Amino acid sequence: VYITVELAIAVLAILGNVLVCWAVWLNSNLQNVTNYFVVSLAAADIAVGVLAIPFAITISTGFCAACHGCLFIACFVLVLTQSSIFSLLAIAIDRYIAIRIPLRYNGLVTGTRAKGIIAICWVLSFAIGLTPMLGWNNCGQPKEGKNHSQGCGEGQVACLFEDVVPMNYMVYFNFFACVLVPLLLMLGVYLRIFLAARRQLADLEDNWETLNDNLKVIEKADNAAQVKDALTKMRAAALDAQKKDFRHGFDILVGQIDDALKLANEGKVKEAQAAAEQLKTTRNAYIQKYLERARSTLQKEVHAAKSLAIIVGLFALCWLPLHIINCFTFFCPDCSHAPLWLMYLAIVLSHTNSVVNPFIYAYRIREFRQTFRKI
Ligand SMILES: Nc1nc(NCCc2ccc(O)cc2)nc2nc(-c3ccco3)nn12
């Protein structure tokens, strides 16, 4: 039962995520910093699928060996999880930068810096993974009955997770800080990302609404005064929207508005409306082209952000229950120990996470869809 599902999930991990690594290599279209991060995460998934499943299946029954080796068997999954969480945080930061500040996105994001951050986060993940090895372990604590049952020699120690790895260390430091604080920061980042996109779309629509309504009032107006009032709002909206296509269009538009305002200050309303009709051409052409490009660009950014948010949510909801039951067991010693059959089920769910990643990229991103069908 348990042995069957672990092997079944393991096989889907390699072949499922090797395509994601394969796709980034045989498709120049899908190659950027976000893909570099997600392929680092995919390499972490490859590593967990290849190694942790045999490690879990051999530690589930028992494999007596040196205490350091057994501790490594248990910390390898944790380091491959910390790598994934760091990669997800980097992805979230990349998306926030790209959407909030598109002008400086290319300036502040570079491939060399992305590779450097990937290396830094991987070695940092190794730091947490190897932290229990050095000094913080439970090797010194005797288990007489156990070591007699498995026939443990002096050098070799039996493998039993909860009694070989520091439970208090795990529950206190491993969960709280380096899981949650990344998760809370990531949630705040995603909320900020969506708020920024909504605000930007609202601002563009408001500027278009002003540049249309004021013009309509211009033809539907009279006795100057209102004309000079409306062109002031036109200038304000045009400058705000501007802050070769966009620049030249807005320069021509503000020049025409200045001409109309200068010609209407003298009191010549007929040619004031003539100049408004003159505006009506540049408005249509350049402003409509700019708006149609901007809306599609923002929609694409929002779609990418939603995809990555879904990946994050799946990661969190797959790695949450195990830690929750672990901290429940730690903080209620008087409570009866959690059932073995349920604990194994939760571990299966956690490892399942690696399988889920390629399915999202094969179902939502059309760029990966074509190349997977190619294979
Ligand atoms: N609680 C736990 N158990 C095991 N394996 C030991 C299975 C077991 C659990 C309870 C029992 O009474 C006898 C055996 N691996 C485990 N890995 C983790 C883990 C990975 C990341 C965070 O926690 N927790 N965890």
Numbering used by the authors: 8 to 250, 267 to 398
According to the publication:
However, applying it to GPCRs without signaling proteins remains challenging because most receptors lack structural features in their soluble domains to facilitate image alignment. Although integral membrane proteins like GPCRs are challenging to crystallize, a highly successful strategy is to engineer a fusion protein replacing the third intracellular loop (ICL3), located between transmembrane helices 5 (TM5) and 6 (TM6), so that the inserted fusion protein can mediate crystal contacts. We use two model systems for this interrogation, the adenosine A2A receptor (A2AR) and the Smoothened receptor (SMO), both of which have previously been interrogated by X-ray crystallography and cryo-EM. By exploring various fusion strategies, we determine a 3.4 Å resolution structure of antagonist-bound inactive A2AR in detergent micelle and a 3.7 Å structure of unliganded inactive SMO in a lipidic environment.
Finally, the crystal structure of this construct revealed that the BRIL domain is rigidly linked to the receptor 7TM domain by two continuous helices connecting TM5 and TM6 of the receptor to the N- and C- terminus of BRIL, respectively. Despite extensive data collection and image processing, we were unable to either identify clear 2D class averages with sufficient clear structural features, or generate a reasonable 3D reconstruction, even when we used the low pass filtered crystal structure as an initial reference model. These results suggest that a BRIL domain alone, even rigidly attached to the protein, does not provide sufficient features to enable particle alignment of a GPCR. Following the successful strategy employed with hFzd5, we next added an anti-BRIL Fab fragment to enlarge the fiducial marker. Apparently, the larger fiducial marker successfully drives particle alignment and yielded a reconstruction with a global resolution of ~3.4 Å. Further focused refinement improved the resolution of the transmembrane domain to 3.2 Å, sufficient to enable model building. The cryo-EM reconstruction of A2AR-BRIL/Fab is almost identical to the X-ray crystal structure of A2AR-BRIL, with a global root mean squared deviation (RMSD) of 0.9 Å. The ligand ZM241385 is well resolved in the ligand-binding pocket, demonstrating that this strategy can enable visualization of drug binding. Based on these results, we conclude that a Fab tightly bound to a rigidly attached BRIL is necessary to serve as a fiducial marker for single-particle image alignment.
